[PDB]
Amino acid sequence: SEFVHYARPIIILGPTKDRANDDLLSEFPDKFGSCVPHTTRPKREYEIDGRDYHFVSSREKMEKDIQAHKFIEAGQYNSHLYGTSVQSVREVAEQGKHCILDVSANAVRRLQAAHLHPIAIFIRPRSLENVLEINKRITEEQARKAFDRATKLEQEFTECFSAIVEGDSFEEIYHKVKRVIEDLSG
């Protein structure tokens, strides 16, 4: 443990977080990776089990694993369960790549409780108009909604974010994001 250090999984929250998640995996494929989630949906014939998803045969068993606290974030969509498991985050991180995560803010303590202490970054907009600045592809109704949801997220989870990132542009946001990971890399 003194010589080799596991790569800390990464949870970026807030406006443009998916654009940051896309960009980081693109810019450094050997440093950042994605983890395979489980679903109870049946696979299409071009989806590859164990690589695109882990396809769960017994849907009854997935909720047994969910109640055994085997997932950090679970969910349903179109009648099918979805979820990132703890073992799927450990597999990326043990390759020493930072695992890029689409989890809610609630998954931070469960990763911590599982000792996979993530870098939790909150992108914080400074106004409605500021959301319009760092995301020039949303309508005001989407911006106002983006701004309120951000406000509630900081109120409830401000204490679990390793860094809060601000800027007048995604370029500025994305720079500071990359540097937080540098200063918390290890």
């Binding site: 695109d52 998803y53 969910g75």
Partner: peptide, 12 residues
Amino acid sequence: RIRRDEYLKAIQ
């Protein structure tokens, strides 16, 4: 991530 929009969609 782009092959798992249904997952991403489920989490919200």
